[PDB]
UniProtKB/Swiss-Prot annotation, chains A, B, C:
Gene: groEL
Record keywords: ATP-binding, Chaperone, Cytoplasm, Isomerase, Nucleotide-binding
Family: Belongs to the chaperonin (HSP60) family.
Record-linked InterPro entries: Chaperonin_Cpn60_CS, Cpn60/GroEL, Cpn60/GroEL/TCP-1, GroEL-like_apical_dom_sf, GROEL-like_equatorial_sf, TCP-1-like_intermed_sf
Top-level taxon of the source organism: Bacteria
Gene3D superfamilies according to UniProt: GroEL, GroEL-like equatorial domain, TCP-1-like chaperonin intermediate domain
Short name of one Pfam family: Cpn60_TCP1
Enzyme class per UniProt: isomerase
Official protein name in the record: Chaperonin GroEL
SUPFAM superfamilies, per the entry: GroEL apical domain-like, GroEL equatorial domain-like, GroEL-intermediate domain like
Length: 524, 524, 524
């Protein structure tokens, strides 16, 4: 179709303009004195929220170019949240800060490529400074503390998470679901989890958590790609009877078959969910078998000459429950006999001996870990469905936060870690004045978060910023109480992983925009 | 879709502008000298009314932003009426008052978060002052008086309500329906009430009371979530024959299924209404059964392996009548055999012995109380359908009013309780000048109701206001007679619950708006 | 339909204007300091890229005339990439340079035909100078080096390519596909490749590479033209079952039949792709048999009186994979028995004896070479699907680059070969002043690439250009490091084939435009 093409500066102001709408709408929620954003719904009363992620989701601009700018940082910032369970808004305000100054520099005539290189250098240094600033989270005493803070000072949640992590280990898989009534429950079940998500939304039946949740579903394990639902029919009808949902784990589910599956399940004509098998190549076939054993199913591989039409309800695997993310599938409580599952572990465990490679050995250990490890299940009790649903949410959040803390530690929150780290890189330089400016653009941008928070609090950003810089370590401003002190002691922290991610992603999209010379889009 | 985003002040004036249309349209009806609002209907002659709730229902603005403002206070104020059976208009004029001054303060540069905190502090104090001013309504002599006043001085209605409350107790369930002829009847029957409202309006067939009222309906008790009307068809056709309405009580009724139900019943193609089962977890499954027993129906649980398709008219429960609120479902006169119902009570009653927990013991006691307690049924007689329908309405109102009076007592009406309470909080202060202004904003707003009432009467608001403040306790102005004196003695009161609710809800939405910085809506 | 006709200058500015949008959008990506171009997608976030080919694909202008100019160079420049696996962007910036000056000359009154003749003369000389500048790439030590450079300094890739070329020879067919896991595999299998492309895009299911890729497909060999899908039905339904894709190799696939195929496959209703049988006349029927034998299929020739309707799944040929280009079809790993395939080779090989004509002998030699030769298959291993997919892409690129290097050698990259060659043709003249100008127009244009690269780097083009001219051989500017030196030594090279192609194609379309006097298009 006829396109609308914009070049250089003309294109860049459009982008900036677009990210400014996104950033301005989202940053007002930042900090403890964050404001409310009202999101209109065609049906009923508007939604009032202080959640930057909710606000960002709703942002789409009419001007095609401006919209491209917003969608660009919007996409990258979302990754920060996916990665550490937080930091989307932060990444967004950081991106705005970097992009704004970056573009000014460009307009002044400085080289885009050098500005980007400088920004990157500054960020790389900043990330290292961040690790040095970081305090470890390893003993379950600390784990409980971080969980309590992430749960809005709910010691119960911290306790719950620490207990679960103790059961299945720090690397263990931990799941959280509705409780059966005023009282939590923690149980480890035959189970497993791989890095594959729904092959399409819509399968989503839990819009809240944006996940697919099937109960007592059959599991189809097909070592091949399914493109036409013609092979499915025989098996889909057996699943139609028995009246149970279906999980399809194949090499992939494409076109006509996926399309048909997205529709039917979206019409109550049998609940089905499809996800790619884990991994690729040979080890992908080994894992399909692992799942098989675990779920007492049978893998239907073409190699051996098997056909999906000849597949019967008995070839199907089975587990009490399955949950599917955008990029995660976790099978809860398989039917496989301990005899089977335990012999499977035994096999893999012995192959680890014959392992003639470190890589090969690790990959095998990975698999036994999944089969043998199992799955921790936290049931959140509460007395009144509301309080229960509410706490369940707080648990899910604190869990994701704690997970990250255990991985990369914690640093001062409230935007002070970023400002602290930036104050330490004053002498950092690059290969030319352009890169040096790029570096300063990044260091200045690192003050955006704190400044915004202070701004939302109605205090003078430059004064608080100035003071915090004057201090050391995790010394900072507690926006909530207007008191300076040790941020960690005052319980205002962020998993080092979320701050690191927010910065890296923000810098990433900012770098790309600063180095954009042309934009192509459809005619209005 | 491309959105229209507004920030800060630009957004706030739009909101204010919108709530002003709503408030101005509704407040003219306030007080005894309230004016008429003409509401146009596409068919026939317009409706002339003095009912603020009817007027508010019709308010929707063309400007998207202004409309969001109106819809926001509209939604919160409606809650006041739901909670105490009155106070929506009041909450609305209070909200306008708080929002107007609050925004001025914001424009002057004061901090929104502090203004809100101050408003809240003032309201918290006001509510406590309201409890202190309140006169108890406990003996059935008082109950009758309050009911008489709420029924426009009809001693009969007061007598009726007092008798009913005496039968089933203050906590009892009391229902009212058309009489069989010039003479009231009061009977306690098999019945129950639980805290679940319609899963969607539209099911509403009594716009007046905003309730769904089904007669001799069939009750489907499904232990599971219904998302596709495909499972319903068999049962929906069995109900199509017989020609009776249907109540769906499932774990939930979502998307496709709900959507289809909302439509069909909105086209006379079978009257249906769906509501969530009461409670959650295990106890939700026990209650579903209680209802079943009570209605002589059978629960259709997937656990036991039952399917909705294989559900026959005999599995359905039945009762002479069911009334559904925004948050309440009440089953009147179930078909369940005393044998069954009494045996059920026996079970639960024994479980209370084996109860190894205070909590568990209390929950069981709740259930027996519901089952064993039944429901009081008032049949309003009159001699001429017209007088009967009229009096029936006055009884329903007085009932809701008295219910509230019994819960939290009564205070002077005509807006004087709010002005009285405000006059007592003059020295109330917060943590800074901004919060102090917020407090004053709230105290001033508390005069809005009275002032408006006096204004509608054509008197000088500031003069009456001033005089009433000079007095004490429930001394105030009787707008109807232009005489000052004891508001309670003069029979001009409000259940303390409705005044408390109106204030808290108004303050709630006002606080949210004052702290709004961004608004997102669709492009016109 | 009513047309819009433009003549002379009015038409030419429109064209120029159109190629300027295309060239300006694409050239900003050129050097190692190339900028990003953001390409909008109706769904989701925009695409950020530095790939001139992606950008060019998206360019379409609203003005019909301007659009014709863009599409014209766009089509010819694409051929450069098809021919040598690179050079599209270059060809485009060259075309812009030639067209711009060429048109100025025309406006000044110089003869278009002479200008073109001069441009061509200069290009013919330039191409010869390019062969002379060229360094050979013959021993596998060189082949590995060129592959390593083309794979971003990944020695592994060079090694892989060298090994494969060593197996099947420099003329051999080399294929690359996903690995089975962290480790490369190289195997020679039964296969063949002929010069016939998809009979229609759309069949394309790998937009990235712009190729059709079918796995375990059935191959229909029909010696005749297929114009109506009525003959297909029986065979298409046999393929619908089994659930495998289909490759139609017939004399041709026209109208109704092609139309239907394009659609159905574009709806998941069976993946099909059709291409013309290789060659023509008699030898066309011979090769169809060659393919049949190789894939264990059966040729359905009308001559013998066979009908497509009577064709069964067994008549169909089969291979693990087939890949189709714009102008190439390559069948990977056929099912035909070694016995058959080797007996066929035996036949042809004897016919080479009986050959009574050098021409006939050569043609036969070509066929046995394809049959006997096979296809090398490179499986790229990596440990994590992502790294694997990434490396696979680098391998495919390096492969195409090395193929070209082996054919015509390598020359200095970064645009210096073109500038070097131009500097050597200063005294080149034609038959009149108009041709002489044409020559200078071309020689000047040859500086475009380097100058643009230098420009994107933020350096003064004329200065770098001037210095590089002053040197000799492959002495040039390394835009990446800002250092002058031997371009080949510094590892900055281009297969002589891509530079030659880029220039000839650019000059080709430029010559056509310079000699355009009229343009006809539809009315807006
Ligand atoms: K917040
Ligand atoms: K009134
Ligand atoms: K490039």
């Amino acid at each position: 179709a006829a396109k609308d093409v914009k070049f250089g500066n003309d294109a860049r102001v459009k982008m900036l303009r677009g990210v400014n709408v996104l950033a301005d709408a989202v940053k007002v929620t930042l900090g403890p004195k964050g404001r409310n954003v009202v999101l209109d719904k065609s049906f009923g009363a508007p939604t009032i929220t202080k959640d930057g992620v909710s606000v960002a989701r709703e942002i789409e601009l009419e001007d095609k170019f401006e919209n491209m700018g917003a969608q660009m940082v919007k996409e990258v910032a979302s990754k920060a949240n996916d990665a550490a369970g937080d930091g989307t808004t932060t990444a967004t305000v950081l991106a705005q800060a970097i992009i704004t100054e970056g573009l000014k520099a460009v307009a002044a005539g400085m080289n885009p490529m050098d500005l980007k290189r400088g920004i990157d250098k500054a960020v790389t240094a900043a990330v290292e400074e961040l690790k040095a600033l970081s305090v470890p989270c390893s003993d379950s005493k600390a784990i409980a503390q971080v969980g309590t803070i992430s749960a809005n000072s709910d010691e119960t949640v911290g306790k719950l998470i620490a207990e679960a992590m103790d059961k299945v280990g720090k690397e263990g898989v931990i799941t959280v679901e509705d409780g059966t009534g005023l009282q939590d429950e923690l149980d480890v079940v035959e189970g497993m989890q791989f890095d594959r998500g729904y092959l399409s939304p819509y399968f989503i039946n839990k819009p809240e958590t944006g996940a697919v949740e099937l109960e007592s579903p059959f599991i189809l394990l097909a070592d091949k790609k399914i493109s036409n639902i013609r092979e499915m029919l025989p098996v889909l009808e057996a699943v139609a009877k028995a009246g149970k949902p279906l999980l399809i784990i194949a090499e992939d589910v494409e076109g006509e078959a996926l399309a048909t599956l997205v529709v039917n399940t979206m019409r109550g004509i049998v609940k089905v969910a499809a996800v790619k098998a884990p991994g690729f190549g040979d080890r992908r076939k080994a894992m399909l078998q692992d799942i098989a054993t675990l779920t007492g199913g049978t893998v239907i591989s073409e190699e051996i000459g098997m056909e999906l039409e000849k597949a019967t309800l008995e070839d199907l695997g089975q587990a009490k429950r399955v949950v599917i993310n955008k990029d995660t599938t976790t099978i809860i409580d398989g039917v496989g006999e301990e005899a089977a599952i335990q012999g499977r572990v035994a096999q893999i465990r012995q192959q680890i001996e014959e392992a003639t490679s470190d890589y090969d050995r690790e990959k095998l250990q990975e698999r036994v870990a999944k089969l043998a490890g199992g799955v921790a299940v936290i049931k959140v009790g509460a007395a009144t469905e509301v309080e229960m649903k509410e706490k369940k949410a707080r648990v899910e959040d604190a869990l994701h936060a704690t997970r990250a803390a255990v991985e990369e530690g914690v640093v001062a929150g409230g935007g002070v870690a970023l400002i602290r780290v930036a104050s330490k890189l004053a002498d950092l330089r690059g290969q030319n004045e352009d890169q040096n400016v790029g570096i300063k653009v990044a260091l200045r941008a690192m003050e955006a978060p704190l400044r915004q928070i202070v701004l939302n609090c109605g205090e003078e950003p430059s004064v608080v910023a100035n003071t915090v810089k004057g201090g050391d370590g995790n010394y900072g401003y507690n926006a909530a109480t207007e008191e300076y002190g040790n941020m960690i002691d005052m319980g205002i922290l962020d998993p080092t992983k979320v701050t690191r991610s927010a910065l890296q992603y923000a810098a990433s999209v900012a770098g790309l925009m600063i180095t954009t010379e042309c934009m192509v889009t459809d005619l209005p």
